[PDB]
Amino acid sequence: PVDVSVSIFINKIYGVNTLEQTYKVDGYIVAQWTGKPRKTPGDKPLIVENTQIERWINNGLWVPALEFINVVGSPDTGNKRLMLFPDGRVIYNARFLGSFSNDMDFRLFPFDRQQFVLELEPFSYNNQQLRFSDIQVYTENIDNEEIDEWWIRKASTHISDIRYDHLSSVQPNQNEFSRITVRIDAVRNPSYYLWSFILPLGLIIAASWSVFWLESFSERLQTSFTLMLTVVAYAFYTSNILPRLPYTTVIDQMIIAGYGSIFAAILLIIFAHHRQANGVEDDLLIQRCRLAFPLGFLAIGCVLVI
Amino acid sequence: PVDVSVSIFINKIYGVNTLEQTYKVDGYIVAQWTGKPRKTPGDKPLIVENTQIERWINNGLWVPALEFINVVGSPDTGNKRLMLFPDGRVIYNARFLGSFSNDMDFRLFPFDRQQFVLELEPFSYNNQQLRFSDIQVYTENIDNEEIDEWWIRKASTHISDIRYDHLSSVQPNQNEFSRITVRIDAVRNPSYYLWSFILPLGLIIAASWSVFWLESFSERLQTSFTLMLTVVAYAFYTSNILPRLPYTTVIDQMIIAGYGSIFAAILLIIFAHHRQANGVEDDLLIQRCRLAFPLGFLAIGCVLVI
Amino acid sequence: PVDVSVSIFINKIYGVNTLEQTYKVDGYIVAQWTGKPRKTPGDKPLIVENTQIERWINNGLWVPALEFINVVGSPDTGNKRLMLFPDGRVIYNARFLGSFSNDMDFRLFPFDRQQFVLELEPFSYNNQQLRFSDIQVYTENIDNEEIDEWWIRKASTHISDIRYDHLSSVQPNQNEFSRITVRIDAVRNPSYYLWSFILPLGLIIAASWSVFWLESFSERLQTSFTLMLTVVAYAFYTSNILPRLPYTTVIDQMIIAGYGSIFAAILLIIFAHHRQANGVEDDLLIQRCRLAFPLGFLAIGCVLVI
Amino acid sequence: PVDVSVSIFINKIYGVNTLEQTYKVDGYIVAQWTGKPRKTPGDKPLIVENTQIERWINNGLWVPALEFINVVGSPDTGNKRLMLFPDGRVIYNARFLGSFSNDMDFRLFPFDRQQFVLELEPFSYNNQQLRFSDIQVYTENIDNEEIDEWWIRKASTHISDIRYDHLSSVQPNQNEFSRITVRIDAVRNPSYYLWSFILPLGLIIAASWSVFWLESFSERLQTSFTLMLTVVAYAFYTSNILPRLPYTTVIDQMIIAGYGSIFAAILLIIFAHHRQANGVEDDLLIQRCRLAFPLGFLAIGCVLVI
Amino acid sequence: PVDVSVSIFINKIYGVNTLEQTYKVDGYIVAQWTGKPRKTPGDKPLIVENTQIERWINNGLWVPALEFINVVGSPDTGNKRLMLFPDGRVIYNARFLGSFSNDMDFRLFPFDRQQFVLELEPFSYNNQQLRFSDIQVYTENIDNEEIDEWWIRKASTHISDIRYDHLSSVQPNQNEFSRITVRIDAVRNPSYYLWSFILPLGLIIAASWSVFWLESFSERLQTSFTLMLTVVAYAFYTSNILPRLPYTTVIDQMIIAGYGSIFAAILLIIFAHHRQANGVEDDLLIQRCRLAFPLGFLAIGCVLVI
Incomplete structure (x- = not known):
């Protein structure tokens, strides 16, 4: 069971679409796991950028596909980046911008109490466990608020295990994936x-x-x-x-x-x-x-x- | 006649475009068929995610193109994934988001009775049969109804055979493709x-x-x-x-x-x-x-x- | 002078843009021509799908580029497909969705008499002739007319030769391309x-x-x-x-x-x-x-x- | 100093965006220059289409990047095409659709006097000269001007030399590129x-x-x-x-x-x-x-x- | 610590989106750094245009990924270009068009005082220093102003060092990237x-x-x-x-x-x-x-x- 450590960096939560219960999120994802130690040129961790990453996959290097469970469509990926350490461990860092979905109740409209959620989860790996999840809501709690449409509170993690009752042709126990669920609470201005x-x-x-x-x-x-x-x-x-x-x-x-x-x-x-x-x-x-x-x-x- | 088993997972039906009689659907498709047993590394099913799948095709691995008969445009594919078993069988799993078309009557507007439909069908295979079709409308019925624009009922499958009378230069009997037709009934709020x-x-x-x-x-x-x-x-x-x-x-x-x-x-x-x-x-x-x-x-x- | 046989399947004509005199058309194009007989694995026609077609081009297989003369932008190509017969002949089949242009007069607006047109024509081949053109307006002439914005009539073909008074640095007679022009008449509801x-x-x-x-x-x-x-x-x-x-x-x-x-x-x-x-x-x-x-x-x- | 002969074919000028001073243009570009004579299969010029052109570049064949100085964004390229003659000369032909910018004054709105402009210019070649420029405004002047939003006049070329004062660490005289400037005059309806x-x-x-x-x-x-x-x-x-x-x-x-x-x-x-x-x-x-x-x-x- | 010299050419600042605090910028980026002298065919600098650049990377040629810290989404890249000199040094030149974000206060709307900002910064390089930054706001300081929505002032550079308090698994001193910050001041018309x-x-x-x-x-x-x-x-x-x-x-x-x-x-x-x-x-x-x-x-x- 591979141990992965995720780190989500929220950069901006904007564009709330009341009718579709949608909102856009811009930020970076950082996933870290350890592999069989490697010989890196020079020594100091290797740095594989965009075009290149797809190449290293073709040569065996595995890179887990972490899907964003609640994303309407498919995220706009910015810069991808693989940092390979000699001692094995690999660090995946990429910037994204996508439209996420979530149940949103706008009954008391003038005065809304909403909560923006993200949901990461390995797309095809039963036993590839998500270790610890950290979110950097490096936004201004009481710096800007009445210049922005929404006022926030503080980040909120929660790892868990989801069970799908009709996955692939498997019985042993392949139906439990670990899902990181991030939550940011906000109130309307x-x-x-x-x-x-x-x-x-x-x-x-x-x-x-x-x-x-x-x-x-x-x-x-x-x-x-x-x-x-x-x-x-x-x-x-x-x-x-x-x-x-x-x-x-x-x-x-x-x-x-x-x-x-x-x-x-x-x-x-x-x-x-x-x-x-x-x-x-x-x-x-x-x-x-x-x-x-x-x-x-x-x-x-x-x-x-x- | 290859036997394929399809599984459609409806994730969200939104954005109804009254004038074009269009509606968007997000979810995953899962196709399973059996091939000539294979030698898989280790021995547990093999997993080919994104970039890679296109490579295995170039090495013979055949993967049937399953078209979405009633889609306006061309679906937004998320994560693709091939799970190859040693005993042969192959499982195709991919997430999609596309705009589908269908006859929609909005005569009684304030009170609509519409039905969202999906139509899968092999793009170029006469005798490549669709075995059993299953749809997981894991939406929550009498759960959030009054937070959402539409109220539903229950899934609805139906495999059948479509006959085209002017295919490619062929006369034997090549003109019958099996089409999966899914139906979801909904009423307006x-x-x-x-x-x-x-x-x-x-x-x-x-x-x-x-x-x-x-x-x-x-x-x-x-x-x-x-x-x-x-x-x-x-x-x-x-x-x-x-x-x-x-x-x-x-x-x-x-x-x-x-x-x-x-x-x-x-x-x-x-x-x-x-x-x-x-x-x-x-x-x-x-x-x-x-x-x-x-x-x-x-x-x-x-x-x-x- | 290569003989090509085209077959256009109109699936849906929607989204009329009054100001730009634009309208969207979804359907499939089927082009058939004969080449030097080939050895097809087994013997039955050889079916090459998406990713693969581009490969067969790199190995000599020629595939004529048929441009859509009156398309604003560049069509949204769905599934491409090449069916190679042992006896030579090749059948090209692909699904498309594009925005086409045409002179549209909306003077009598409430009661319009418009006509949707398509115009196929080899992009770079003087003597590569379009044999016979067929269009399947597989719609309901009078089945749901009052559910749809437009009412139609019946398909309408017309092959011809277009002369460009200034093409390549050629002049023997290279300036005549055969253009298929399809016409569908419609009246506003x-x-x-x-x-x-x-x-x-x-x-x-x-x-x-x-x-x-x-x-x-x-x-x-x-x-x-x-x-x-x-x-x-x-x-x-x-x-x-x-x-x-x-x-x-x-x-x-x-x-x-x-x-x-x-x-x-x-x-x-x-x-x-x-x-x-x-x-x-x-x-x-x-x-x-x-x-x-x-x-x-x-x-x-x-x-x-x- | 390579001699290039450009030919712009205006197909449709539409979608004027008053606020951004933008307008869309669909047409084809044709560039011709002469290279070291080549051995073409058969002998009549060789026709290289889409996918293929990128290949011939990888084998030395040079193809000058002609940028559209005043394009907001990056053009929508349709069909690309390389025509290689045995006697050397090469003809580049491609269809494009892009959004161009230009200073537009809409002060007297109801009665506008605007002029649509195109500006070609080698993206990275100091001495790669643009020989003669020709524009085919095969749109119809006195046609149906009372059907279209704009009325025109007649094409208008003008080659020139632009001098940039802040280029590479080059001193000799590398700072003069030849720019083709096309102008089409129009009046609002x-x-x-x-x-x-x-x-x-x-x-x-x-x-x-x-x-x-x-x-x-x-x-x-x-x-x-x-x-x-x-x-x-x-x-x-x-x-x-x-x-x-x-x-x-x-x-x-x-x-x-x-x-x-x-x-x-x-x-x-x-x-x-x-x-x-x-x-x-x-x-x-x-x-x-x-x-x-x-x-x-x-x-x-x-x-x-x- | 590699020395890079950046040069930003602002071509047009348009499309201000009041709600998202967004604005579009079109222009070119030019980055220059020196590498191990090279044998350039002939002797005068070598020019690698579009398709080709990705190739030279696959052969070792390193090209630093310079991210645009404050861009919503991912820029629209026009023409890329690598100019390799024999004496080593490399010059990267590419045209871009992207939507940038920035805190914008529209409280006094009719009379706004806004400032458009750009923020370059190596995506994955700790000690790859940005030498000198230059911006060409080649616009008409007074020439036209009541033809355009915004009136400007003058460019404004500022290189600095940003410290991330928890990047990769690197404790030494790897957490300081040099960030070029460009500022253009504008007033509403x-x-x-x-x-x-x-x-x-x-x-x-x-x-x-x-x-x-x-x-x-x-x-x-x-x-x-x-x-x-x-x-x-x-x-x-x-x-x-x-x-x-x-x-x-x-x-x-x-x-x-x-x-x-x-x-x-x-x-x-x-x-x-x-x-x-x-x-x-x-x-x-x-x-x-x-x-x-x-x-x-x-x-x-x-x-x-x-």
Whole structure:
């Protein structure tokens, strides 16, 4: 059972694709294992770079194929490099950039709690064990954060053994590969979305109610039609700029709320009026519920928070 | 007639392209067949990974080219791997990611019933038969359904024989290739579309009718012009966010319905008024059909459901 | 003069790029010619697949480079395959997916009459003649037409000789290559565009005129300003969803028509009023041309159909 | 000093990228030079195609690397081809598709005057001279210019010598390479933009002024608020469909003009009214400058043309 | 410790990707170092172009792999070239085009102060020192600037030594690589954004206040609802055209300011009216604060500039 020591260097985690639950990662992988000591020119460990590595494979030198279990597609390999030591051991170092997949829940969108994961695992070796895994999240925990879309926490390893129940034509016990699973926790930078989406959306819902502080009945009604046209014009601005998903976020709901608030008003207003014993018998208290559902909406809003 | 045993591992089905009737699939293919027993180093199965496989071909080792009949373009191959057994048999294992095509009907859009299909078939071998086909939809059913856009059911195999009537200059009986056809059934996650499209679109059509509970004639009419401007502003929000198709979905129709509901109102309102024995002889019952077509629209709507 | 027999199999024609006059085609090419009889292992045709073909070229085996004259870029080659017969003849079979160019006129957009073309031609062989050309448009002439964006007709061949008035430093007669030209006729699926664009655009132009059935002068005018704002909001919805072109389509014109219809109204209304012998002397007939240009627009529309 | 004769065949110039000042070009390059006479199988020139050319290089055959000085990225090479004559001379022919750069000024956007340029030049040869350059703009000048986005003129060559002041540690005179510079002049197809942007934008600015032919003060003002909302809704439609640039085009200004015209009106109207010696003494002449700045805008417009 | 002399030729810096903090750079790299004198066919330096270089490596010729530390992905290499001198020294020259990363702050968007950086560094050589670094920003310092999106300054070198605290299994002193760091300073071209965004946005905020110069109460209020609908329609036009970021720019704030200015007005107006001692006791001074916050907004604006 060959002992391999992996070292992942995260360089940048960017491009989150909300719909496909994808995110790009740029960094280097370093794998080290020991082989039958070798005679290296001069003596100081040998250095085989790009084109060359493929040659040394053709001459016997084995190099384990470490697949990235959760990569959509196939990584963009930069510089590959083999460092061969006289005492045997071999060190594989290569830079990569690939799109990884992972279950991502964007339900509370404006305020996300996501976790970026990597998953290394020998592509075709049952007993070729991954020794110790180390990740260098050489990123700035509290240096830059509000210049970047996401805020992090700290690296997180975890080696384990995966069992496939239908591998190759084997019975002895060939179905357990060791998988390195790295985890980086991150939280979304709310700022932008609050000050450009949540806030103004609130002032619209607020100023929505001020349709009651209108005297006439025609004014009280016809104005909610320009108010209706406003929430649509907003849901539009919201959708065209926000990340598409298969479910509704918090903002997606405030938009529905605004739609109900205005439809509610439409009913009351077209009720207070025609709930008359003469015609203009606008129920003085109902037509004046100017503080009834404006706060009765903090009751409908604190139920969406339950 | 060589016997091949295929095993398809579906890893992720994503990126549905409504217009091109395309969808991406990531997974591995495993093909097994038996050859003339071989002398393998040591004696345990041999493993040829990437660069190497191409070399063994140049030394006679035959490896059947299994084409993906319905793939738009040419798959993104990840790690290839040949496992050669001493007793002969060879096992081909490779990871792939490709865009597949298939007839897809998105007529009832908000509520889709689609089926993702794969079609393997030897690219150039008449009598090289596909033995048994197995598919591991190791996706998690009633697990993350509401975090993902599509909900599934269960795998579905089916080997068969395809006959081409104009092959290479051959007449004997060389025109029948065995094709593996895999099928995965899925249903779309309605949620988002209902609560952000169907609903508000309904409240707009509803509040649309409340143009009758207006006293004056000018109000009854000029208000449907801001109502007209609203349905357009909505069809806009809908189109910019929905998947483009060559035909109309359900929602595309609710939008047409709202256009007619408002044009209908325009006619009645500009009829009730000028259908006078004086000037302002608004047919008191017609001007008050405030419950005539609002429910007479549940008759026009239950005919689109006929 | 070598005799080659080509056979093109159209698998899918998709992705029409209106601006670049481009469209993607997936399928296989099959070329057959006869060479000096050969000794094939066993005796049955010798099947050489991918990696291998390039090798047989290095050992003399000639394989004519058949260029796709009208391909933007360079095709995506799938599986190549050489079938060598003992009696000499060689059969080349490969799958391709490429973007082809062709003059495309989208003037009558909603209702297009386009034709997808392919053009094969030896890249470097004057006297290497293309014998007979066959195309298998193995599609459903009338099976699923309303699920797909385009409707077709039937294949269409045509071999010919192209003369380049300036090729190599040759002139005896080396300037005539045989070019296979395939043609597939198709018509656009109007549906969607009619029911989501033409129709509602008409009801907007219609309801546009109902600005005359308004009593007051301020109403008659100020309402066309919300009507003006409507046509713009529509031209917007139209452009964002329609295919960009360098010229105007039919729909691009109905939008111009609506802009004139509303500007026309603006003039009449601000004329009828200030065209008085007292003040509100709205020429009792002009202010009531409620049926003057509404049908006088079917005269302006039947002149755009001239 | 080797004499090379180049021949560029322009096949299609498309995809202009306004922001990066990029445009795609598809065509073939043909380079001819003479070498030490050779023994060609048979005797008629020898034809070397794709894979093979790289082989002949490995056997001494030199082939000059001709770089495309102004190409963003690295061309998409189609079919390469070497034609070797017995009398020595060699003819290189290959098809290419690349994205070229060049200074492009889109200030007068609707009416552009651009020029597409190519620049060939030996990548590493000081005295390897480019003899005569010929370009076949076998595109069709007066063909269907109203189908294509750009209209052309005629080819344009120009060989020259470029001097680099920072080369290898060479002193004698190694710093002058011959560069072929091809130029194709083109003008944009105004049509679409005039009839879908310039025109309606004008009718909006026109009908903008008709805010003065309103009686009341509130009408005169409140209407310019729906007029304001209209210019914004238009600047939106314009931006979303027009090519993004770092500067303003003609249309970008008409939009600014419409913004000033409406802000001007806002001032006058809120001046005429409150510029009194009573309360409603709207300066009968100012409130009636209905022809003051409407033509005084053809003065503001003929100064933007000044 | 090998002495290498690098020379970077910037050809074009384009395509800034605000969200990923990416930008594309096209140019050439030239590296020179001296080796054991060689016998060059003839005597003048020897030139190995593309395909060939990889060959000379297979025959011992070492060529140091110089990685681009901050490149997202892997550069697009154009023409490679090795110039071997008889006196030993070797000159590597290759053209590249790649996407580079760097911390970019776009807080003051309309007016950016960015700096494009390159970072070369031997991929696997501890003592292979970078001698002197030179950069040719052969661009037009003033020549053209309002034709291009960015304005520059002057090149900027800086060689240094980077220490990795845990590289290979090497304890001696192998952890210091010499890194060339190039810096180019640039400022964004404000023009377009000022005249198409800042300005009209101001005129909207200005004309926003003129809602006070309205007589009635219903007018004063209902007009701010068409004013509200305007700011939204503007925030939309702004977002769809501006570069997406995780934080708010200057413009993102003017939009918030307009939202508050309008919500402020809504409060005052629905205060002046109902803050009575009868009914219409519109605090003649408050209802006439027509110059209160219009300039009291230059106080709220000069606090955002605090």
